[PDB]
Every structure is written in C-alpha cells, then in structure tokens.
C-alpha cells in the first residue's frame, strides 16, 4: 500500500539529516564543546583573535575567567 513510500523516503530522512548532525557535532568538537564563534563583522573577529592571543595555548575556543586575575 501507500506506506511503502516511507522506507524508500526514509533514506532521505537519513541522508538529509546527518550533515546537520555532522556539522553540529564537529562544531562542538572542533571548538571544544562551545559552538563555533561567528564573525560577520570585523569587531567579532577582533574579539576572537584577542581570545586566541590571550589563550596562551593559542586557541580562541579555550576561555579563561577570573582565575588568572589576582
């Protein structure tokens, strides 16, 4: 019957579903938990480069709070 469309179309439900899963998971993986910071304007990029520079480990995606400040 008409329900035989479901498993043929379920491949699409798997094909067009993992790219979002791949990106979202790797975004948390590449950037260490937090999602990738976006910089559509120069101000945000200047923030990121400052975060990378202040990181010491030279990665923008690792942040330090009040612990360093004494």
């Amino acid at each position: 019957m008409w329900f035989e469309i479901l498993p043929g179309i379920a491949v699409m439900a798997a094909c067009l579903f993992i790219p979002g899963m791949a990106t979202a998971h790797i975004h948390k993986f590449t950037n260490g938990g937090k999602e990738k910071r976006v910089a559509h304007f120069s101000y945000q990029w200047n923030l990121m480069e400052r975060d990378r520079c202040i990181s010491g480990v030279n990665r923008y995606h690792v942040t330090k709070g009040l612990e360093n400040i004494d």
């Binding site: 910071r37 942040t63 709070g65 009040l66």
Partner: protein, 171 residues
C-alpha cells in the same frame, strides 16, 4: 623627513587583563557604568591628541581600573558570574537573549553586595562631559603655516579706457 621617536619598551608593561571575551562581555554594562572615569578621558585623549603615543599614561589607568573592578567581583558573587559567562560563550553570537536567567542572577547579586545597578537601555550610548586636566592641543594634526591668500579684488568699476582696445575697434 626626520625622527619617528616612540615610547620605549619600559612603559609597555601593564597588568593586562587575562580574561576572555565572554567574561568581558558578561559584565560589560556594569564595568562600563563603574569604570567610566578612566575610560572617558582616555578616549577623549585618543580623539583630541589624535596620537596613541601621547595617551600612554591614560592607557595604563583604564587597564588598571579594570582589575579593581574585576577582583571586586571575586570577593563577591563570582560563582554566579562564572555560571553566567560560561553560558554566554556557548552561543556563537554571544547574545544575552538566551541567558536571561543568569543575567538576573548576576544582577541580583551585584545589586546588593556592591550596588552596581543595571544600566538602562541607551544609557551607555551617551556623550558625557568628562572633566580633564590636559589642555587641548594647539594643532592636533601638527599643521604647518598657511599660505597667504592672494590680495582681494576691490575698487569701483571704471569704464574700459578707450573702449575695447581690440585692433581698430573703438567705443
């Protein structure tokens, strides 16, 4: 064309803030509304002097005044502060609309332990009458002298002597 004399490496050792962007932006408004005294005249120095080298003395003060504000939180509700700024970073835009509950927690803590009120909308975006001691530069662009303009035309009009004077034409 001359000397490009610039400050030595001696004065370029300030206690640089070691925080990241999220913790910087988590406070932001409170820091802006509590450390405006060293921010305003330093920025005014940046505009009036038109030269980074002449505003080194105010450049270190703003960084130094940041520490006094920052360690003041550490002696206070810094644990709610940590929960806040560790929730802001998770958003890629570093946007406050997704961290309203921690916005309250930081605000309610800082409201009574210290008293720094939340700056209302548009309050930071305000030209201020910052008091200053330095005199205004006589020429911020170090402009040289100005060429003397050509002498001004004047005198009442007089009829052209002997008319057109072009070849034999008269009158």
């Amino acid at each position: 064309p001359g000397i490009v004399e610039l400050p030595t490496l001696e004065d370029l050792k300030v206690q640089e803030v070691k925080v990241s962007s999220s913790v910087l932006k988590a406070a932001a408004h409170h820091y802006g509304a509590q450390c405006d005294k060293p921010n305003k005249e330093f920025m005014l120095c940046r505009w009036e002097e038109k030269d980074p080298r002449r505003c080194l003395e105010e450049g270190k003060l703003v960084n130094q005044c940041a520490l006094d504000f920052f360690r003041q939180i550490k002696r206070h509700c810094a644990e709610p502060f940590t929960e806040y700024w560790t929730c802001i970073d998770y958003s890629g835009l570093q946007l406050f609309r997704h961290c309203r509950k921690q916005q309250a927690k930081f605000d309610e803590c800082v409201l009574d332990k210290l008293g720094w009120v939340r700056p209302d909308l548009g309050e930071l975006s305000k030209v201020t009458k910052v008091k200053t001691d330095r005199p205004l530069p006589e020429n911020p662009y170090h402009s040289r002298a100005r060429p003397e303009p050509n002498p001004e035309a004047e005198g009442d009009l007089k009829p052209a002597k002997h008319g057109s004077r072009l070849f034999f034409w008269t009158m």
